[PDB]
Each structure stands twice: as C-alpha cells, then as structure tokens.
Design a protein around this ligand. Structure first.
Ligand SMILES: C[C@@H](OP(=O)(O)OP(=O)(O)OP(=O)(O)OC[C@H]1O[C@@H](n2cnc3c(=O)[nH]c(N)nc32)[C@H](O)[C@@H]1O)c1ccccc1[N+](=O)[O-]
Ligand SMILES: *CC(=O)N(C)CCN(C)c1ccc([N+](=O)[O-])c2nonc12
Ligand SMILES: [Mg+2]
Length: 166
C-alpha cells in the first residue's frame, strides 16, 4: 500500500546498519560488515496506518559521487545519523544535510537527526549542542541505541511523520 522511501546516511561506523537491522529484524549486530548498499523492506503499523518501509542503508561518504547520487536520489526521507562518542561524525552532519539538499535539489527535504550509541558512556557530543543543531535546521532530534533498542522506533517512525507532513 502506502510506501515510505527512507535513506540512512552519515559517517562510517556511526551505527547506520546496526540501527536498520534492529528496527527491521529486532536484534543487535555486533560485527564489522562494511556496507556497499543494502535495502530492507518491512510492513509495519504507524499511528494506525498500515504501510511499507523501503529503507536504503548507505556507505559513509569517503566522498560524494555520481554513483552514490544514483542510489540516494530516489529517497523520500533521510535519517541523518552520528554517534555521540565521535565528534567528527557530528561535524559531518552539515555535509550530508548539504549533500542531501543538493542530491534532491530541494530546500525542504524530510529529515531527522539521530544521535546513536546512547548505551555508551563518556560522550564527546552533548545533547544540548546536537539538539540545538536540529533546531537550527528546523528538524527533529532523536537519540538512540542500536544495542538496547532505546529510541529506534521513535527515530524511524518520526522520519515517516516528517515525510507525511511535507
Ligand atoms: C566501514 C564502516 O561501515 P559503515 O557502513 O560506514 O558503518 P555503519 O554506519 O553501518 O555502522 P554499523 O552499524 O556497521 O556499526 C559499526 C560498529 O558499531 C557498533 N554499533 C552500532 N550501533 C551501536 C549502538 O547503538 N551502541 C553500541 N554500543 N554500538 C553500536 C556495531 O556493533 C559495530 O561494531 C564501519 C563498519 C564497522 C565498524 C566501523 C566502521 N567505520 O567506518 O568506522
Ligand atoms: C571490518 C572492516 O572494517 N574491514 C574488513 C575493512 C578492513 N579493516 C579491518 C579496516 C579498514 C579501514 C580501517 N580504517 O581506516 O580505519 C580500519 N581500522 O581498523 N580496521 C580497519
Ligand atoms: Mg553499514
């Protein structure tokens, strides 16, 4: 029925795959499996609407390319992931945001900012600066853990609400 094209973007190793698998398959993967591209599709219920999620798990940049453009350009909404113990992945959200806007050639793209690995202590990115980042872009912010499942439904189902509202 009603499909939602989602894309999971952000730096290498911030938990993009781990997040998606947890949502779709309901377990935590504790392994090193670099992604080229992988998609996941599951029927779920969101606020009483039966719908399909069509989800695209990307690679960290390593850089923009036409090939990467070719995969991402069909996405409807973007889950922009960083990890709260890795300041570089946080500094990188600006680039993706920007890249996503250029790929979709739009000044308003459905988006949500995700801060992953919330089970880990001694964070290097405070919730305040990140929450302030989401607000400066006018988009929501959700903290998550692929390991504990904290926030993971919130993050994804929220992006769907941003897609419904655009
Ligand atoms: C090549 C690149 O690959 P990548 O595809 O850029 O990396 P992903 O963003 O898909 O990241 P992934 O979900 O594979 O998780 C990487 C590691 O962090 C762990 N992890 C993910 N989410 C969480 C979480 O919420 N909590 C905790 N405690 N751990 C979590 C995983 O168990 C794994 O060991 C890549 C892949 C794997 C590892 C690193 C890496 N990198 O570039 O840095
Ligand atoms: C699991 C994994 O990342 N690989 C099989 C790729 C090869 N490895 C082990 C690898 C690649 C790149 C980097 N890096 O530049 O950071 C690595 N750091 O530790 N293992 C790395
Ligand atoms: Mg991955």
């Amino acid at each position: 029925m009603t499909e939602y094209k989602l894309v999971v973007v952000g730096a290498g190793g911030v938990g993009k795959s781990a997040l998606t698998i947890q949502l779709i398959q309901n377990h935590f993967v504790d392994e090193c499996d670099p992604t080229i591209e992988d998609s996941y599709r599951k029927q779920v219920v969101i606020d009483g609407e039966t719908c399909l999620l069509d989800i695209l798990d990307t690679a960290g940049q390593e850089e923009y390319s036409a090939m990467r453009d070719q995969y991402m350009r069909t996405g409807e909404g973007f889950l922009c992931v960083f990890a709260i113990n890795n300041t570089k992945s946080f500094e990188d959200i600006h680039q993706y945001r920007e890249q996503i806007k250029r790929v979709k050639d739009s000044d308003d793209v459905p988006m949500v900012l995700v801060g992953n690995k919330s089970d880990l202590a001694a964070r290097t990115v405070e919730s305040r600066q990140a929450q302030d980042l989401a607000r400066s872009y006018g988009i929501p912010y959700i903290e998550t853990s692929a390991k504990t499942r904290q926030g993971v439904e919130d993050a994804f189902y929220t992006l769907v609400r941003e897609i419904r509202q655009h």
